[PDB]
Amino acid sequence: GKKLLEAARAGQDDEVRILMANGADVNACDPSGITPLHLAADKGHLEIVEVLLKYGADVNAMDVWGRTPLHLAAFTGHLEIVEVLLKYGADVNACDLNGYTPLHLAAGRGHLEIVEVLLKNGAGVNAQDKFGKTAFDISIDNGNEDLAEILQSSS
Amino acid sequence: PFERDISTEIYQAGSTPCNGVEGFNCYFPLQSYGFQPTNGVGYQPYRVVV
């Protein structure tokens, strides 16, 4: 189990392919609940995400803070990771402990394409965090005019 | 074994300092205690001594 997580953290293709073809669990995690897909979306290893989704990895990874693979896809700014995960059937309105939707993270992190591709899925523009703020408030805090326009267009 | 966890500060993961600023990855101090009025053992607090 730990070998798969370390190999995914190391960005290894054949190693993880052999490990998950050997019989190891695809959703092995540490006491902090770090799934292999969590690190795959963290470091932008596209082939790792593809292999995990093909072999049937979890789509609703849940760590201590409540982060999801799509949350880190929007946080780090990875192009096709979020696309393949939404093709898997990922939820769009997942709320973590802080209540920060992935759209809020993408807006605050300046990823226009991620915001738009989540918006196509049916993203909730009127989603609120634990403080009652929306993605528009975080965007205007970040001072992004074009992002504010594109978020207000669908609102 | 035989140690005390005394953390009078807040986390920072790898990037965002949180010294008096709203940090999105800095988390926050210890969460409070939900003394529910009348519920099951999941919300029935107990007092213990050693």
PDB file of C-alpha atoms in Angstrom:
ATOM      1  CA  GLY A   1       0.000   0.000   0.000  1.00  0.00           C
ATOM      2  CA  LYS A   2       2.650   2.511   1.030  1.00  0.00           C
ATOM      3  CA  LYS A   3       4.765   1.468  -1.965  1.00  0.00           C
ATOM      4  CA  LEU A   4       2.022   2.578  -4.365  1.00  0.00           C
ATOM      5  CA  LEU A   5       1.689   5.940  -2.606  1.00  0.00           C
ATOM      6  CA  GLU A   6       5.449   6.531  -2.663  1.00  0.00           C
ATOM      7  CA  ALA A   7       5.694   5.538  -6.335  1.00  0.00           C
ATOM      8  CA  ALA A   8       2.826   7.884  -7.215  1.00  0.00           C
ATOM      9  CA  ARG A   9       4.590  10.640  -5.269  1.00  0.00           C
ATOM     10  CA  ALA A  10       7.728   9.860  -7.301  1.00  0.00           C
ATOM     11  CA  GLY A  11       5.905  10.118 -10.643  1.00  0.00           C
ATOM     12  CA  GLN A  12       6.559   6.521 -11.720  1.00  0.00           C
ATOM     13  CA  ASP A  13       4.442   4.879 -14.433  1.00  0.00           C
ATOM     14  CA  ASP A  14       5.598   1.271 -14.806  1.00  0.00           C
ATOM     15  CA  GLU A  15       6.133   0.909 -11.052  1.00  0.00           C
ATOM     16  CA  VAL A  16       2.561   1.889 -10.163  1.00  0.00           C
ATOM     17  CA  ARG A  17       1.217  -0.147 -13.088  1.00  0.00           C
ATOM     18  CA  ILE A  18       2.965  -3.269 -11.778  1.00  0.00           C
ATOM     19  CA  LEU A  19       2.033  -2.520  -8.154  1.00  0.00           C
ATOM     20  CA  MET A  20      -1.687  -2.099  -8.844  1.00  0.00           C
ATOM     21  CA  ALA A  21      -1.487  -5.042 -11.257  1.00  0.00           C
ATOM     22  CA  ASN A  22       0.103  -7.117  -8.471  1.00  0.00           C
ATOM     23  CA  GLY A  23      -2.988  -6.950  -6.254  1.00  0.00           C
ATOM     24  CA  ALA A  24      -2.429  -3.894  -4.080  1.00  0.00           C
ATOM     25  CA  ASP A  25      -5.388  -1.734  -3.104  1.00  0.00           C
ATOM     26  CA  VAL A  26      -6.006   1.201  -5.435  1.00  0.00           C
ATOM     27  CA  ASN A  27      -7.171   3.470  -2.574  1.00  0.00           C
ATOM     28  CA  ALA A  28      -4.331   2.902  -0.113  1.00  0.00           C
ATOM     29  CA  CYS A  29      -3.835   5.858   2.218  1.00  0.00           C
ATOM     30  CA  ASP A  30      -1.750   6.948   5.193  1.00  0.00           C
ATOM     31  CA  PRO A  31      -3.331   7.825   8.565  1.00  0.00           C
ATOM     32  CA  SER A  32      -3.928  11.266   7.010  1.00  0.00           C
ATOM     33  CA  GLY A  33      -6.051   9.625   4.294  1.00  0.00           C
ATOM     34  CA  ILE A  34      -3.883  10.521   1.287  1.00  0.00           C
ATOM     35  CA  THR A  35      -5.122   8.541  -1.712  1.00  0.00           C
ATOM     36  CA  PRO A  36      -2.850   7.931  -4.724  1.00  0.00           C
ATOM     37  CA  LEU A  37      -5.201  10.088  -6.805  1.00  0.00           C
ATOM     38  CA  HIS A  38      -4.683  12.869  -4.254  1.00  0.00           C
ATOM     39  CA  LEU A  39      -0.948  13.019  -4.991  1.00  0.00           C
ATOM     40  CA  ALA A  40      -1.574  12.405  -8.703  1.00  0.00           C
ATOM     41  CA  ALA A  41      -3.731  15.537  -8.880  1.00  0.00           C
ATOM     42  CA  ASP A  42      -1.255  17.333  -6.604  1.00  0.00           C
ATOM     43  CA  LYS A  43       1.792  16.857  -8.848  1.00  0.00           C
ATOM     44  CA  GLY A  44       0.058  16.841 -12.244  1.00  0.00           C
ATOM     45  CA  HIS A  45       0.947  13.301 -13.342  1.00  0.00           C
ATOM     46  CA  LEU A  46      -1.584  12.872 -16.146  1.00  0.00           C
ATOM     47  CA  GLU A  47      -0.750   9.236 -16.890  1.00  0.00           C
ATOM     48  CA  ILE A  48      -1.072   8.366 -13.193  1.00  0.00           C
ATOM     49  CA  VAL A  49      -4.586   9.830 -13.068  1.00  0.00           C
ATOM     50  CA  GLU A  50      -5.476   8.015 -16.291  1.00  0.00           C
ATOM     51  CA  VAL A  51      -4.197   4.676 -14.964  1.00  0.00           C
ATOM     52  CA  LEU A  52      -6.017   5.061 -11.639  1.00  0.00           C
ATOM     53  CA  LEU A  53      -9.306   5.959 -13.325  1.00  0.00           C
ATOM     54  CA  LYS A  54      -8.949   3.079 -15.801  1.00  0.00           C
ATOM     55  CA  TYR A  55      -8.305   0.615 -12.965  1.00  0.00           C
ATOM     56  CA  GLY A  56     -11.174   2.047 -10.905  1.00  0.00           C
ATOM     57  CA  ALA A  57      -9.802   4.485  -8.343  1.00  0.00           C
ATOM     58  CA  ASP A  58     -12.072   6.349  -5.948  1.00  0.00           C
ATOM     59  CA  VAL A  59     -13.771   9.472  -7.309  1.00  0.00           C
ATOM     60  CA  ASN A  60     -14.597  10.872  -3.833  1.00  0.00           C
ATOM     61  CA  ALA A  61     -11.240  10.869  -2.051  1.00  0.00           C
ATOM     62  CA  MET A  62     -11.661  12.275   1.460  1.00  0.00           C
ATOM     63  CA  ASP A  63      -8.603  13.319   3.480  1.00  0.00           C
ATOM     64  CA  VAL A  64      -8.470  14.886   6.953  1.00  0.00           C
ATOM     65  CA  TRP A  65      -9.301  18.381   5.690  1.00  0.00           C
ATOM     66  CA  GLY A  66     -11.842  17.086   3.156  1.00  0.00           C
ATOM     67  CA  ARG A  67      -9.811  17.808   0.021  1.00  0.00           C
ATOM     68  CA  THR A  68     -10.722  16.033  -3.221  1.00  0.00           C
ATOM     69  CA  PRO A  69      -8.611  15.311  -6.328  1.00  0.00           C
ATOM     70  CA  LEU A  70     -10.573  17.921  -8.287  1.00  0.00           C
ATOM     71  CA  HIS A  71      -9.940  20.410  -5.473  1.00  0.00           C
ATOM     72  CA  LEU A  72      -6.193  20.068  -6.031  1.00  0.00           C
ATOM     73  CA  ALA A  73      -6.750  20.007  -9.796  1.00  0.00           C
ATOM     74  CA  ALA A  74      -8.273  23.485  -9.489  1.00  0.00           C
ATOM     75  CA  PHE A  75      -5.752  24.587  -6.835  1.00  0.00           C
ATOM     76  CA  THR A  76      -2.601  23.629  -8.750  1.00  0.00           C
ATOM     77  CA  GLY A  77      -3.951  24.373 -12.232  1.00  0.00           C
ATOM     78  CA  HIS A  78      -3.811  21.030 -14.038  1.00  0.00           C
ATOM     79  CA  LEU A  79      -5.549  20.900 -17.403  1.00  0.00           C
ATOM     80  CA  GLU A  80      -6.622  17.334 -18.195  1.00  0.00           C
ATOM     81  CA  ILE A  81      -6.685  15.925 -14.641  1.00  0.00           C
ATOM     82  CA  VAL A  82      -9.921  17.755 -13.863  1.00  0.00           C
ATOM     83  CA  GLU A  83     -11.273  16.843 -17.310  1.00  0.00           C
ATOM     84  CA  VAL A  84     -10.709  13.112 -16.835  1.00  0.00           C
ATOM     85  CA  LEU A  85     -12.012  13.249 -13.254  1.00  0.00           C
ATOM     86  CA  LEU A  86     -15.226  14.991 -14.330  1.00  0.00           C
ATOM     87  CA  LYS A  87     -15.506  12.415 -17.117  1.00  0.00           C
ATOM     88  CA  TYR A  88     -15.349   9.808 -14.344  1.00  0.00           C
ATOM     89  CA  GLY A  89     -18.405  11.440 -12.766  1.00  0.00           C
ATOM     90  CA  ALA A  90     -16.911  13.673 -10.091  1.00  0.00           C
ATOM     91  CA  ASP A  91     -19.199  15.805  -7.953  1.00  0.00           C
ATOM     92  CA  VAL A  92     -19.109  19.537  -8.651  1.00  0.00           C
ATOM     93  CA  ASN A  93     -20.434  20.870  -5.304  1.00  0.00           C
ATOM     94  CA  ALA A  94     -18.148  19.062  -2.860  1.00  0.00           C
ATOM     95  CA  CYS A  95     -17.679  21.057   0.353  1.00  0.00           C
ATOM     96  CA  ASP A  96     -14.621  20.519   2.548  1.00  0.00           C
ATOM     97  CA  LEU A  97     -14.218  21.398   6.232  1.00  0.00           C
ATOM     98  CA  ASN A  98     -13.595  25.044   5.306  1.00  0.00           C
ATOM     99  CA  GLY A  99     -16.605  24.933   2.975  1.00  0.00           C
ATOM    100  CA  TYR A 100     -14.473  25.981  -0.007  1.00  0.00           C
ATOM    101  CA  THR A 101     -15.923  24.704  -3.271  1.00  0.00           C
ATOM    102  CA  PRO A 102     -13.475  23.775  -6.058  1.00  0.00           C
ATOM    103  CA  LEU A 103     -14.838  26.701  -8.078  1.00  0.00           C
ATOM    104  CA  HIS A 104     -13.801  29.055  -5.270  1.00  0.00           C
ATOM    105  CA  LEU A 105     -10.275  27.610  -5.304  1.00  0.00           C
ATOM    106  CA  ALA A 106     -10.025  27.878  -9.090  1.00  0.00           C
ATOM    107  CA  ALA A 107     -11.258  31.482  -9.031  1.00  0.00           C
ATOM    108  CA  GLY A 108      -8.888  32.492  -6.243  1.00  0.00           C
ATOM    109  CA  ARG A 109      -5.969  30.753  -7.967  1.00  0.00           C
ATOM    110  CA  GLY A 110      -6.365  32.459 -11.358  1.00  0.00           C
ATOM    111  CA  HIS A 111      -7.269  29.405 -13.465  1.00  0.00           C
ATOM    112  CA  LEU A 112      -9.787  30.699 -16.004  1.00  0.00           C
ATOM    113  CA  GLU A 113      -9.908  27.489 -18.045  1.00  0.00           C
ATOM    114  CA  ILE A 114     -10.502  25.403 -14.913  1.00  0.00           C
ATOM    115  CA  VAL A 115     -13.305  27.749 -13.837  1.00  0.00           C
ATOM    116  CA  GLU A 116     -14.943  27.514 -17.260  1.00  0.00           C
ATOM    117  CA  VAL A 117     -14.604  23.728 -17.557  1.00  0.00           C
ATOM    118  CA  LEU A 118     -16.176  23.303 -14.117  1.00  0.00           C
ATOM    119  CA  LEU A 119     -18.889  25.791 -15.112  1.00  0.00           C
ATOM    120  CA  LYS A 120     -19.751  23.627 -18.121  1.00  0.00           C
ATOM    121  CA  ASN A 121     -20.402  20.675 -15.788  1.00  0.00           C
ATOM    122  CA  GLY A 122     -23.220  22.597 -14.088  1.00  0.00           C
ATOM    123  CA  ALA A 123     -21.266  24.355 -11.361  1.00  0.00           C
ATOM    124  CA  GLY A 124     -23.200  26.286  -8.740  1.00  0.00           C
ATOM    125  CA  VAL A 125     -22.272  29.944  -9.132  1.00  0.00           C
ATOM    126  CA  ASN A 126     -24.367  30.766  -6.042  1.00  0.00           C
ATOM    127  CA  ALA A 127     -22.358  28.474  -3.748  1.00  0.00           C
ATOM    128  CA  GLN A 128     -21.335  29.901  -0.372  1.00  0.00           C
ATOM    129  CA  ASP A 129     -18.454  29.062   1.955  1.00  0.00           C
ATOM    130  CA  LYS A 130     -18.481  28.893   5.762  1.00  0.00           C
ATOM    131  CA  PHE A 131     -18.223  32.708   5.865  1.00  0.00           C
ATOM    132  CA  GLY A 132     -21.062  33.200   3.366  1.00  0.00           C
ATOM    133  CA  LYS A 133     -18.764  34.418   0.586  1.00  0.00           C
ATOM    134  CA  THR A 134     -18.988  33.140  -2.987  1.00  0.00           C
ATOM    135  CA  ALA A 135     -16.447  32.703  -5.768  1.00  0.00           C
ATOM    136  CA  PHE A 136     -17.207  36.259  -6.915  1.00  0.00           C
ATOM    137  CA  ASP A 137     -16.174  37.703  -3.542  1.00  0.00           C
ATOM    138  CA  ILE A 138     -12.914  35.733  -3.563  1.00  0.00           C
ATOM    139  CA  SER A 139     -12.256  36.834  -7.151  1.00  0.00           C
ATOM    140  CA  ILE A 140     -12.821  40.521  -6.391  1.00  0.00           C
ATOM    141  CA  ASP A 141     -10.534  40.047  -3.386  1.00  0.00           C
ATOM    142  CA  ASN A 142      -7.955  38.686  -5.851  1.00  0.00           C
ATOM    143  CA  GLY A 143      -8.598  41.599  -8.232  1.00  0.00           C
ATOM    144  CA  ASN A 144      -9.322  39.615 -11.417  1.00  0.00           C
ATOM    145  CA  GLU A 145     -11.492  41.680 -13.766  1.00  0.00           C
ATOM    146  CA  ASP A 146     -11.806  39.108 -16.562  1.00  0.00           C
ATOM    147  CA  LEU A 147     -12.495  36.312 -14.078  1.00  0.00           C
ATOM    148  CA  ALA A 148     -15.130  38.491 -12.412  1.00  0.00           C
ATOM    149  CA  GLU A 149     -16.752  39.098 -15.806  1.00  0.00           C
ATOM    150  CA  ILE A 150     -16.795  35.414 -16.745  1.00  0.00           C
ATOM    151  CA  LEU A 151     -18.169  34.436 -13.326  1.00  0.00           C
ATOM    152  CA  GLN A 152     -20.881  37.114 -13.457  1.00  0.00           C
ATOM    153  CA  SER A 153     -21.854  36.173 -17.027  1.00  0.00           C
ATOM    154  CA  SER A 154     -23.209  32.776 -15.945  1.00  0.00           C
ATOM    155  CA  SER A 155     -24.673  34.176 -12.707  1.00  0.00           C
TER     156      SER A 155
ATOM    157  CA  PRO B   1       4.658   7.975  24.565  1.00  0.00           C
ATOM    158  CA  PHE B   2       4.591  10.302  27.597  1.00  0.00           C
ATOM    159  CA  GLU B   3       4.540  13.586  25.688  1.00  0.00           C
ATOM    160  CA  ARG B   4       2.345  16.688  25.632  1.00  0.00           C
ATOM    161  CA  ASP B   5       0.900  18.235  22.460  1.00  0.00           C
ATOM    162  CA  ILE B   6       0.981  21.978  23.165  1.00  0.00           C
ATOM    163  CA  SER B   7       0.572  23.791  19.829  1.00  0.00           C
ATOM    164  CA  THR B   8      -0.340  27.430  20.500  1.00  0.00           C
ATOM    165  CA  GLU B   9      -0.100  28.392  16.822  1.00  0.00           C
ATOM    166  CA  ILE B  10      -1.419  27.428  13.384  1.00  0.00           C
ATOM    167  CA  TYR B  11      -0.306  25.261  10.470  1.00  0.00           C
ATOM    168  CA  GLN B  12       1.222  26.376   7.171  1.00  0.00           C
ATOM    169  CA  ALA B  13       1.441  23.715   4.496  1.00  0.00           C
ATOM    170  CA  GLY B  14       4.153  24.816   2.089  1.00  0.00           C
ATOM    171  CA  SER B  15       3.443  28.227   0.592  1.00  0.00           C
ATOM    172  CA  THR B  16       1.075  30.592   2.392  1.00  0.00           C
ATOM    173  CA  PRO B  17       2.173  32.345   5.599  1.00  0.00           C
ATOM    174  CA  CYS B  18      -0.717  32.952   7.976  1.00  0.00           C
ATOM    175  CA  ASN B  19       0.674  35.559  10.386  1.00  0.00           C
ATOM    176  CA  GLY B  20      -2.483  37.538  11.029  1.00  0.00           C
ATOM    177  CA  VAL B  21      -3.818  36.985   7.498  1.00  0.00           C
ATOM    178  CA  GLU B  22      -6.580  34.771   6.111  1.00  0.00           C
ATOM    179  CA  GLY B  23      -4.560  31.847   4.776  1.00  0.00           C
ATOM    180  CA  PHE B  24      -6.415  29.352   2.621  1.00  0.00           C
ATOM    181  CA  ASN B  25      -4.005  26.540   3.572  1.00  0.00           C
ATOM    182  CA  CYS B  26      -2.998  27.704   7.059  1.00  0.00           C
ATOM    183  CA  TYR B  27      -6.108  26.105   8.645  1.00  0.00           C
ATOM    184  CA  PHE B  28      -7.146  27.469  12.057  1.00  0.00           C
ATOM    185  CA  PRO B  29      -6.700  26.671  15.775  1.00  0.00           C
ATOM    186  CA  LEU B  30      -8.404  23.826  17.632  1.00  0.00           C
ATOM    187  CA  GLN B  31     -12.103  23.351  16.952  1.00  0.00           C
ATOM    188  CA  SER B  32     -14.572  23.730  19.808  1.00  0.00           C
ATOM    189  CA  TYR B  33     -16.645  21.129  21.688  1.00  0.00           C
ATOM    190  CA  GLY B  34     -20.209  20.264  20.679  1.00  0.00           C
ATOM    191  CA  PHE B  35     -21.984  19.759  24.023  1.00  0.00           C
ATOM    192  CA  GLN B  36     -25.206  18.499  22.480  1.00  0.00           C
ATOM    193  CA  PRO B  37     -28.166  18.697  24.907  1.00  0.00           C
ATOM    194  CA  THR B  38     -29.510  15.127  24.707  1.00  0.00           C
ATOM    195  CA  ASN B  39     -28.080  12.708  22.141  1.00  0.00           C
ATOM    196  CA  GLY B  40     -26.374   9.333  21.860  1.00  0.00           C
ATOM    197  CA  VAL B  41     -22.897   8.200  22.842  1.00  0.00           C
ATOM    198  CA  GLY B  42     -21.517  10.046  19.815  1.00  0.00           C
ATOM    199  CA  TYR B  43     -22.661  13.264  21.514  1.00  0.00           C
ATOM    200  CA  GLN B  44     -22.717  12.062  25.148  1.00  0.00           C
ATOM    201  CA  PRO B  45     -19.562  13.511  26.750  1.00  0.00           C
ATOM    202  CA  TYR B  46     -17.773  11.575  29.479  1.00  0.00           C
ATOM    203  CA  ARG B  47     -15.385  12.653  32.238  1.00  0.00           C
ATOM    204  CA  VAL B  48     -12.411  10.402  32.977  1.00  0.00           C
ATOM    205  CA  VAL B  49      -9.476  10.321  35.402  1.00  0.00           C
ATOM    206  CA  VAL B  50      -6.207   8.371  35.517  1.00  0.00           C
TER     207      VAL B  50
END
